[PDB]
RNA sequence: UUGAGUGCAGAAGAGGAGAGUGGAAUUCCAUGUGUAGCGGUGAAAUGCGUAGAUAUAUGGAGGAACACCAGUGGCGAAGGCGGCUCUCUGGUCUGUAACUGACGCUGAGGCUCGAAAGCGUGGGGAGCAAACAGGAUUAGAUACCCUGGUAGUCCACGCCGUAAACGAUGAGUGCUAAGUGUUGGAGGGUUUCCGCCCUUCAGUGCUGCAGCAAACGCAUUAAGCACUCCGCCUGGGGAGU
């Protein structure tokens, strides 16, 4: 509703999950989806297929309210970073600009221990 | 073989000549290593000190990605 | 001998015409009265900034060169009022060689 | 510590003759001045371990020059220590 | 006057102490949007969530470490030192050859410094994490894996005095083929040389000849040739008891 037709889409995908949320430029939340909701489970939610379906189940709803172009936010070193954008461009949207924002510190944090397996 | 930046007999960096200073930052806003831009040995240091002074008084950005 | 100094600082755009002058001369004074040799004052450039500081995006860039002995308190007294003032954003004292 | 002003000024009040920058009297006078100033600095910042070491070295060197001055003449040695006022 | 030292002329540096200051990031807090999950694993579970979570946007708070430059680079006697600016302050190197005239070297007892962990007194506390709790795997698992978490990690002044504190290579000084890079210099030709070429001082790496080595290898930064001063050793356990 209210046909904003101008917003931004965020992407955030770990080694074990993926999410995509689409809001306006500010942006108050509009529509989002994730492989967690789509019925997939655990050992599979990090696959370049879950990205496709999450992207679709989000865009097919978001564009209802009125939306043609969008901006793209890519966090999350993972494996759906590629499928997600193309899959947005597949179901008829206007991915125009692509900026990669990954939080990198200036060395002021202590990461956890290394894992021994 | 890479020509030195200071063929022009420059002496003082002055940390304000931003035109003079843009030769060495990354197109993103980082710093470029000597072996990449082929600079001097004592020139590599004062360059960095200059631009670090500049990055406080706003005459240059910390991050230019947006 | 005596060292050298370049004291550049920022002033907001929302200044008046008189406040600027009174401030500049006031700092000239508190420079002198502690044994400084104020050489000159200038206004570098009406510049914006590559990133905001508090609520601003531009600022006037004034600058003064001064010489004095090392034990001359003409620097501590400066920074003791610059960083507690209001119309001044930042500043940077630097030895000049 | 000191700067060329007093560094050059004193080396003429203990100069044996003109240009006595050797002259184991002058060297120990200068070292006395400098170790006094360094004592002041240490009383100010008493955790600057990396300069108290240099203080020690200077003290030792002055001790050595004094020892040498004594074993070639005595009247010079006594008259100087009465001139500089040291040697508990 | 050659060793040592001082004068005069220059050069580099994450050498040290004190005083302020900057941005990025993680986290807690305030508010707008927003709907059912988030997070975790080899697989799962514990856990937080419909008292509205994750996400997302704006601002605030607080402590800590300093992205890129970063380099077999630099400095320090060793432990070690990397955001920026200021006040105090040590040491090293090249040139000149004013000046004193062997003032040197090493150095039992003594004194000083001395990573991390640890103790005391008073602060501070964001992340991380011994102990501890819960969840898992296992015949058993008071362990490895996961979710939490206390001292500690930081600051001031005291204390202790130990590491594979390592190049497992004490210190001073002189002599004995080469080649190759690199930090800081001083000279000479070409010269726009500030972009080449030649000579030399000081560190710093790799290859390699005599010689040495039980072999492995080392070789102007000797583990070669030699003098001076110090420390230490004499089968393995018992025991640094």
| Min distance B23 CA to chain A CA atoms (Å) | 24
Helix (H, G, I), strand (E, B) or coil at A96: strand
Q: Give the residue numbers spanning the domain of D47.
A: 1-88
Beta bridge partners of C65: C6, C40
Beta bridge partners of C81: none
Closest of A59, A19, A57 to residue A36, by C-alpha = A19
| Nucleic strand E near CB of residue A2 (< 7 Å) | no
From the CB of residue A56, how many other CB atoms can be counted at a distance below 10 Å?
17
How many independent structural domains does chain A possess?
1
DSSP state letters, D20-63: -SSTHHHHHHHHHHHHHHHHHHHHHSTT-HHHHHHHHHHHHHHH
Q: What technique was this entry resolved by?
A: cryo-EM
How many independent structural domains does chain D possess?
1
* C90/B53 Cβ within 8 A: no
Question: CA-based Rg of chain B, rounded to a whole angstrom?
Answer: 12
- Counting DSSP H helices and E strands in chain A, the numbers are 2, 5
Domain ranges of chain B: 1-66
Q: Which two tokens stand for residue B57?
A: 């008084």
Q: Which residue has the tokens 């990133």?
A: C51
Q: Delineate the domains of chain C, giving CATH numbers in brackets.
A: 3-96 (3.30.70.60)
Are C63 and C6 in contact by the 8 Å Cβ rule? The answer is: yes
Are C52 and C21 in contact by the 8 Å Cβ rule? The answer is: no
* C51/B57 Cβ within 8 A: no
C-alpha distances in Å from residue D60, one per residue of A56, D33, D56, D67: 83, 15, 6, 11
CA B53 to chain centroid, in Å, comes to 11
Chains with ≥3 CB–CB distances under 8 Å to A: B
The span from the CA of D31 to the CA of D23, in Å, is 13
Q: For residue D2, what are the contacts with CB-CB under 8 A and spacing of at least 6?
A: D30, D33, D34, D37
Q: Give the residue numbers spanning the domain of A84.
A: 1-117
DSSP state letters, C12-30: -TT--SHHHHHHHHHHHHH
Q: C48 φ, ψ to 5°?
A: -90, 180
| Nucleic strand E near CB of residue B57 (< 7 Å) | no
Q: Provide the CA D50 to C1' E165 distance, Å, integer.
A: 19
The span from the CA of C22 to the CA of C37, in Å, is 19
Resolution in A: 3.5
A 32-91 residues inside an 8 A Cβ radius of B:
none
Chain C positions touching B51 (Cβ under 8 A) are none
The span from the CA of A53 to the CA of A20, in Å, is 11
């Amino acid at each position: 509703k209210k046909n904003i037709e101008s917003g931004v889409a965020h992407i955030h995908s770990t080694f074990n999950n993926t999410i995509v949320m689409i809001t306006d430029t500010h942006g108050n939340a509009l529509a989002w989806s994730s492989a967690g909701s789509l019925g997939f489970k655990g050992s599979k939610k990090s696959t370049p297929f879950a990205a496709q379906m999450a992207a679709e189940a989000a865009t097919k709803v978001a564009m209802e309210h009125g939306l043609k172009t969008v901006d793209v936010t890519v966090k999350g070193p993972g494996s759906g970073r590629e499928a997600a954008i193309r899959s947005l461009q597949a179901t008829g949207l206007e991915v125009t600009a692509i900026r990669d924002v990954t939080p990198v510190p200036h060395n002021g944090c202590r990461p956890p221990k290394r894992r021994r397996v | 073989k890479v020509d030195y930046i200071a063929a022009n007999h420059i002496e003082y960096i002055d940390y304000k000549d931003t035109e003079l200073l843009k030769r060495f930052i990354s197109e993103r806003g980082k710093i470029l290593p000597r072996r990449v831009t082929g600079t001097g040995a004592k020139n590599q240091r004062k360059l960095t000190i200059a631009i670090k002074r500049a990055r406080i008084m706003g005459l240059l950005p910390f991050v230019s990605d947006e | 001998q005596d060292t050298k100094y370049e004291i550049m600082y920022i002033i907001r755009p929302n200044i008046d015409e008189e406040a600027k002058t009174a401030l500049v001369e006031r700092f000239d004074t508190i420079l002198k009265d502690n044994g400084a040799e104020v050489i000159e004052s200038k206004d570098w450039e009406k510049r914006r900034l590559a990133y905001e500081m508090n609520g601003f995006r531009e600022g006037i860039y004034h600058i003064v060169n001064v010489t004095s002995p090392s034990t001359a308190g003409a620097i501590n007294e400066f920074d003791r009022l610059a960083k507690i003032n209001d119309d001044i954003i930042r500043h940077m004292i630097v030895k000049v060689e | 510590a000191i700067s060329q002003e007093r560094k050059n000024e004193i080396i003429k009040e203990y100069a044996r003759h003109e240009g006595d920058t050797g002259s184991p009297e002058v060297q120990i006078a200068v070292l006395t001045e400098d170790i006094n100033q360094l004592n002041e600095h240490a009383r100010t910042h008493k955790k600057d371990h990396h300069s108290y070491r240099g203080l020690m070295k200077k003290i030792g060197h002055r001790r050595n020059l004094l020892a040498y001055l004594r074993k070639t003449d005595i009247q010079r040695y006594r008259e100087l220590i009465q001139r500089l006022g040291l040697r508990r």
